Nucleic acid binder design. Structure first.
Ligand SMILES: [Mg+2]
Ligand SMILES: [Mg+2]
Ligand SMILES: [Mg+2]
Ligand SMILES: [Mg+2]
Ligand SMILES: [Mg+2]
Ligand SMILES: [Mg+2]
Ligand SMILES: [Mg+2]
Ligand SMILES: [Mg+2]
Ligand SMILES: [Mg+2]
Ligand SMILES: [Mg+2]
Ligand SMILES: [Mg+2]
Ligand SMILES: [Mg+2]
Length: 181
RNA sequence: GGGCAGUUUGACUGGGGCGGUCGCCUCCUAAAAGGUAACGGAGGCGCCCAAAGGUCCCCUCAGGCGGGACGGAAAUCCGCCGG
């Protein structure tokens, strides 16, 4: 389904707002979202491979995309890990399904958070990408109450043709991100 | 069944005994071919794998810095440098 608000938001709204703000010279040099990665630090489900399926299928309806995993390379002896075996969920979303995830983020995910305050502005990686943490993934639409067996956490990532955080800062505000000033 | 009989009871070894060692692999000693000794200096082997093998295809690390709900000295993830 190639169409949505954020599909056009970036275009008939953000496209020229940037050309004014920074003034490019070519249609491509303009900062674009193009890669949303979603991650999970599930060292917890080290034991239960069952709870592995839940964070995965939940991820399915929230990310609107099939989920994937990744076991470690040199695993922490101390915290119950050793070699190739463990677990760390990961699911890169691109094209349009990326958008349809984002629309749920700044218009549903954020507005109903336990005392959400604003996306920490320091979260820019010096270059043009963003990373931010969430505790409850039940703030997502499809997730019902009597269904979650535990508060599994995770953290999202969004890659941008941005070359500096200023340029990224502007490009996320313009698409619609509730920054903590 | 030492009453009795025949015998056995290793070598190296700055004397012999005691100690240590005894075959195989790696490095040094070794003097830029090879090979070289010492009771010279140091470490391993007496296995393991049906996937840890064949071939086809695909991808490429460790680490350093920056960023990320548990966790950051080191899980998993995005980025950039990284032969
Ligand atoms: Mg030119
Ligand atoms: Mg005789
Ligand atoms: Mg003798
Ligand atoms: Mg002697
Ligand atoms: Mg002896
Ligand atoms: Mg030599
Ligand atoms: Mg020689
Ligand atoms: Mg010869
Ligand atoms: Mg000779
Ligand atoms: Mg394997
Ligand atoms: Mg293997
Ligand atoms: Mg760090």
């Amino acid at each position: 389904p190639l169409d949505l608000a954020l599909k056009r938001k970036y275009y008939e709204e953000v496209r020229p707002e940037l050309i004014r703000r920074f003034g490019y010279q070519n249609v491509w040099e303009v900062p674009r979202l193009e890669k949303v990665v979603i991650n999970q630090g599930l060292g917890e489900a080290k034991e239960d491979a069952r709870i592995l399926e839940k964070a995965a299928q939940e991820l399915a309806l929230i990310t609107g995309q099939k989920p994937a995993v990744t076991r470690a390379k040199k695993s922490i002896s101390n915290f119950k890990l050793r070699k190739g075996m463990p677990i760390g969920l990961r699911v890169t979303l691109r094209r349009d399904r990326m958008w349809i995830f984002l629309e749920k983020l700044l218009n549903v995910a954020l507005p109903r958070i336990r005392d959400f305050r604003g996306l920490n502005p320091n979260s820019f990686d010096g270059r043009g990408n963003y990373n931010l943490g969430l505790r409850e993934q039940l703030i997502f639409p499809e997730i019902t109450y009597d269904m979650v067996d535990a508060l599994r956490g995770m953290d999202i990532a969004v890659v941008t043709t941005a070359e500096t955080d200023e340029e990224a800062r502007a490009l996320l505000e313009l698409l619609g991100f509730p920054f903590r000033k």
